[PDB]
Symmetry: C4
Subunit: 302 residues, 4 copies
């Protein structure tokens, strides 16, 4: 039996990350930019989008446009993004942008704005779709196209990758490409680790992401009712990890979407959490590529 999953990881002995500034916790705020790259018959897809909107019981419509769904996504690119970017500038916290290439193509000025502000542009795929059933040839073709578009748009190729709705081949293809420093398509640890299955042989860093400390839950069946639920949820995660960080620091990812936390009713809670985190000493507010370069310098692959 050759069991491909690693259920053990670091076991009872996770490594000390030695974060900069003696930090007891590292925080990675991530802003997804997906608006303009989601399912739409305009984009050539077979159906309309149904995932992550105020229309909490929406289903895909075959061969149809869902106008309300489209409008909800437009809030993200029209209004939410600028509000969120302002918030992070006000507290001088850097972002990593999981940017969908097709979305970025449709609003190049906001992407340019993000680059000028010093945020990291990470690849979030060519399209914002589910890759579960896509043939390997086509998924690999999407991947290379995502890199092309983001390189042209930002000026440098992306060094991180996150699909989200992966298939069985996604991560293998990402690591096979050779050019990424890291990917985030796992939810399996509180610390980065070197991928144990990289035949390429080059070191590939895994920086796990999150589906729980993530504003996606505002629109899911099991899901925050009000902003303060998200604040309390983040505060609890922070508290437990910051406590552990007296001896064994870890990291925490906070996932955000323009069309979701960009609504004023939800932004208030994110600000309260940022204020809470800022009120503590020894917190490393950082970007994901910075975590990756740090890991390389601190725990090189052996």
């Amino acid at each position: 039996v050759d069991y491909p999953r690693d259920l053990i990881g670091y076991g009872s002995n996770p490594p000390h990350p030695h974060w900069p500034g003696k930090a007891r916790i590292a925080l990675s705020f991530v802003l997804n930019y997906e608006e303009g790259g989601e399912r739409n018959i305009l984009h050539g897809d077979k159906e309309s989008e149904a995932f992550l909107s105020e229309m909490v019981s929406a289903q895909p419509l075959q061969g149809e446009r869902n106008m309300s769904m489209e409008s909800l996504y437009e809030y993200g690119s029209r209004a939410g993004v600028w509000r969120i970017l302002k918030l992070f500038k006000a507290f001088d916290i850097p972002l990593t942008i999981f940017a969908v290439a097709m979305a970025a193509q449709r609003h190049p000025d906001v992407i340019r704005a993000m680059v000028a502000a010093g945020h990291e542009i990470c690849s979030h795929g060519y399209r914002w779709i589910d890759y579960q059933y896509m043939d390997e040839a086509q998924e690999r073709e999407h991947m290379l196209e995502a890199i092309r578009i983001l390189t042209e748009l930002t000026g440098e190729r992306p060094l991180g990758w996150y699909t989200g709705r992966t298939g069985p081949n996604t991560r293998r293809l990402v690591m096979e490409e050779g050019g990424f420093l890291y990917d985030c398509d796992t939810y399996d640890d509180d610390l980065p680790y070197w991928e144990p299955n990289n035949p390429t042989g080059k070191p590939h860093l895994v920086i796990p992401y999150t589906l729980d400390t993530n504003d996606m839950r505002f629109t899911q069946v099991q899901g925050f009712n009000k902003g303060d639920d998200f604040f309390e949820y983040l505060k609890d995660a922070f508290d437990v990890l910051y406590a552990e960080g007296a001896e064994a620091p870890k990291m925490l990812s906070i996932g955000l979407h323009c069309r979701l936390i960009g609504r004023p009713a939800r932004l208030a809670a994110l600000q309260r959490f940022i204020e809470y985190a800022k009120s503590h000493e020894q917190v490393w507010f950082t970007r994901r590529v910075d975590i990756a370069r740090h890991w390389h310098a601190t725990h090189p692959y052996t």
Copy 2:
């Protein structure tokens, strides 16, 4: 590629609305009146209603009456409406009524009461149904009939429109009719804007509405558990926008339904929010047609 959606909007430069009384925020409370116009085999539909009731997992019943569903809707027209109207009169806040024409026909006295109180009657369609799949000929026919009924009932034609569950043709037809000042069938901004696609050429104002600061969420899968969740949600939206309004005022819509916020358990939270909003200076409590006339005088279409 001719991409029909506007993902950019005002970009990073939204206009100053110069609301009356130097207001830092404009609030539009909206009361939907749908009861008596929803799906029912009595109305000629193929199935019973399932959307927005205490029967949170209800499905449409083909060729059947759902008696419990009917009774829940009746609470709205029998009891909830009068309670809500009293609340708004007590704080002297005007309403815009998204009135469904068939519903209004069935309770002309409550509509007359709303008109005498000075509330704006806006069209919410001929029937409260999903227009996704309706042929353009029939949808346009519905539209003209809605205008006919509301004109006869109120004494003047409606100047605003909101379908809700739109199809691909709805907004185009509304703007094509020529007689509306505005529509609200978008969720894409925090400010009104002139429709960029009106071949008619006449200026048509878009006043975006909301599916999040909306009591509909009390009955949806992702949804407020208690009144205070809705209060906190509205309070957060208000706070963020009122703060921004020190330099760049915006608006906020609060959507209400007779059968939902009309229940005493839920009305309490709406009153607490009204009290909260009233405790602030520089708040414009207004109707949607008043926003439209203001926009015309302040930022005429160029």
Copy 3:
């Protein structure tokens, strides 16, 4: 057009109920007793039960027993019922029991206990099933059997009726039987009213019930997370109605289930609400038949 629904009711002029003791509000606590009468292949049904249990995503199993579901229902009859009955005895608040006849047959001692404590036994149908699709002949036969069983078990025939999941014929059949003082199969008002469609001609009182101030929501998709959500929800309903009751008193129903509020985690909130209600003067804690007899003496049918 002969529209069978009454969307208007009392309109803007609800009657003053003149509750005993000058009460500003009447409270009707209702305990459902359904355990042992729900769907089960043992009972002859085609499938297992799926409605109102901790197994919130359960579906009916065709031709199968669902052992976990059965066990959850058994908690109600084994443990929850006695805990709830004790609570009400401790505060000397009377109950109306919506008792399912088949359930009562299976635990005659608890029914006898309820009768000795002075609680009203109201009929909740022969079986706890959905009557939407049942033929009129069979539904009427069920009804008469429910009356037979409850009469034998309690010593007197039931004078109230509540099916819950009604079909198009349920209420008509109940009123046709002639022997009931009232039914509760509506959710359409805050006050009792005389049925406008009783060809029998005898006065039949409607005492509306509730799906919102009801512990059923602890197990539904849109649903209280913790006890305090239910407490706050009830407190808000009470507050609004008690306020209105300075000039126009109304009633409020609180619906309970043995297998649900009988759990200690949920009972605490009900006790807090009972304490809250008891802390106010001018509250009529009563049974539904008592409301009906009061209405007869105070607002006889004309």
Copy 4:
């Protein structure tokens, strides 16, 4: 009519458990260890897992691996388990581990760690799957294999059993095997009881478990939004039972999963509850086998 269910139980006269140290309540914290034994085509199943993860609307994928689902489960075995075990060691509270045999085989070191810490290893089945439709021959074969694996791994055979998603034969087979002291596959009481249907004739103890004071609800449609909801829920259950325990002590089960409460955002609430429980005198923090041995000594089967 031979009705197989016991709807009555102890009726109004539950026995006094005489817990050690004069305890007014007995608490059984249970940690499920399922990770590595859930549905997976790697394990020979027909589909991927969908139950109890952050992917709250996940469905099984036929003949496919769901990589995100796998990664979420891996968090449990990689990171959550060690965090949870540390918490319980810090407060010196013993655990009962419902261990799935296939899961234990895949991480023998964590199981050995649990045994050395003095936790009880209880059988949670050979595989973490739904047994509703499994033939009796195959279910019995699974059972014996679970016992084999756990005996080899722990050094002694398991004396308790809990499947969870039982079929109509599960409990009968468990009791037929002869070697268990107890099982927990019911949710029907607040106290242990002797199984009334054990033809074996040997006494078999039932120690009811829970689907409500259970962290599974963090991922279910009806489900805690934030940690504090779970804390309040547990606190309420504790309070009501501790109050009753002045005269009639009972027990309370607290169900936990590595991949769920192991997340820092959720662990905080469990710690707050442990602190709350510890702040009271007369609380028996115990293991399930210890409850069983106590029952044998205190209320032997007659």
